[PDB]
């Protein structure tokens, strides 16, 4: 590992390794090896996200690195990448344009970690999601997944569907309105079975993992088609109760109201734990790039 731009940058072997390092770092001992000691990572979030900025910041600090960075704001991505190369030993970037990280990674000598590019990918988030799943079931092979909500414009879904190709899912249910369906291009990449469906109550009873993404108003024919459809891609307390005893509900946070807040008190709610592995998982990805 060097550039982390796509979920395809990871092999199954690299992922099993990152999981083991995440176990170790989780068990938050005061002797973690400071593999980034004397190194500066720059966090270049052209498109802001405080949750994710702070999460990489804390990983980098836990490993002994110094952090520089910016958040927001006619200078070329290439010129900025060049400058960060004078100033730092690696870059974590978040950008509004698809492919931005790919392109930075080709300009750049130091590693570049994609923390979100446009609607294309967010690979570290996918690593966090599968880490949470494998932690719960001691496996990823054999599981039955359902992705619920917007599956067309969500980079986390794109990264999760791609990373799952390093594993053997039994089946991935794609549950969305007709409008928010996974694009053809992305479905032709996959090497595991998938089935499109409009209502989650049809198959909720079968699914090991339910992964939800927000539907946004700002994305519809008119406000009336959104108001008619919005209601049935929420994770309600009733949809939670119809899931199997051992199943989990996942969501890459923040949330607004796509999850009934009463759900956070059930044992199936796992999105809180999911956000909590973010730091050790990113420490591990960083350890695989700089410390091996």
């Amino acid at each position: 590992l060097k550039h982390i731009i796509s979920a395809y940058n990871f092999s199954r072997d690299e992922l099993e390794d990152i999981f083991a390092l995440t176990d170790k770092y989780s068990k938050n001992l005061n002797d973690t090896r400071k593999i980034l000691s004397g190194k500066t990572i720059s966090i270049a979030f052209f498109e802001p996200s405080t949750r994710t900025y702070l999460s990489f910041q804390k990983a980098i600090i836990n490993l002994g690195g110094d952090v520089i960075g910016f958040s927001g704001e006619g200078e070329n991505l290439a010129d900025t990448i060049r400058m960060l190369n004078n100033y730092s030993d690696g870059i974590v970037m978040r950008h509004k344009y698809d492919g931005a990280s790919r392109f930075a990674s080709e300009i750049s000598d130091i590693p570049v970690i994609n923390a979100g590019d446009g609607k294309h990918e967010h690979p570290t988030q996918a690593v966090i999601d599968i880490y949470t799943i494998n932690k719960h079931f001691n496996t990823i092979d054999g599981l039955v997944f359902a992705l619920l909500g917007d599956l067309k414009y969500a980079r986390t879904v794109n990264s999760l569907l791609r990373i799952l190709t390093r594993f053997r899912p039994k089946l991935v249910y794609l549950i969305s309105p007709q409008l928010l369906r996974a694009r053809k291009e992305i479905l032709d990449e996959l090497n595991y079975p998938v089935k499109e469906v409009e209502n989650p109550f049809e198959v909720i009873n079968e699914v090991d993992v339910l992964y939800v993404t927000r539907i946004q108003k700002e994305r519809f024919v008119d406000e009336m088609e959104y108001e008619k459809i919005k209601g049935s891609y929420i994770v309600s307390l009733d949809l939670a109760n119809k899931m199997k005893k051992d199943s989990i509900i996942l969501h890459p946070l923040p949330r607004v109201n796509e999850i009934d807040r009463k759900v956070d008190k059930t044992t199936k709610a796992k999105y809180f734990e999911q956000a909590s592995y973010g730091v050790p998982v990113r420490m591990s990805i960083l350890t695989k790039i700089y410390g091996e």
Binding site: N76, G99, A100, R102, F103, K119, H120, I186
Partner: protein, 148 residues
Amino acid sequence: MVSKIKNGTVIDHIPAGRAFAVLNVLGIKEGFRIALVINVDSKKMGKKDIVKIEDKEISDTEANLITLIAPTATINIVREYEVVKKTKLEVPKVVKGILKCPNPYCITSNDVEAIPTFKTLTEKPLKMRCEYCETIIDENEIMSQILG
């Protein structure tokens, strides 16, 4: 309808009207001599264009870009009035520069140093894909980027 060439490249059998687009596709537009005829008779095509570039032997790489708009074209390399190679055109694997990505949020549609690149996905009905954003384009989008 144009004279014989001592050294260089002859591109025959281009669809009528598309010689100017063949030159663009090759980056040509200084030093060397060029001749074209447009809309001349072709026994197999009805009509056709012909381009002749003195003093430049076109590579197989540059020549395969010609298939994006003139898949029937034939390329002959000429030395001392004699044809020394009839090149076999293939569909190119990668296309940098000639084609833009129709996604306005692709880094290639916004940063000048970020040069558009498409990798061919299927030759058959031709589909190509942006290496930055995975947007797909077909023969129709291809041809109307270049013939405009």
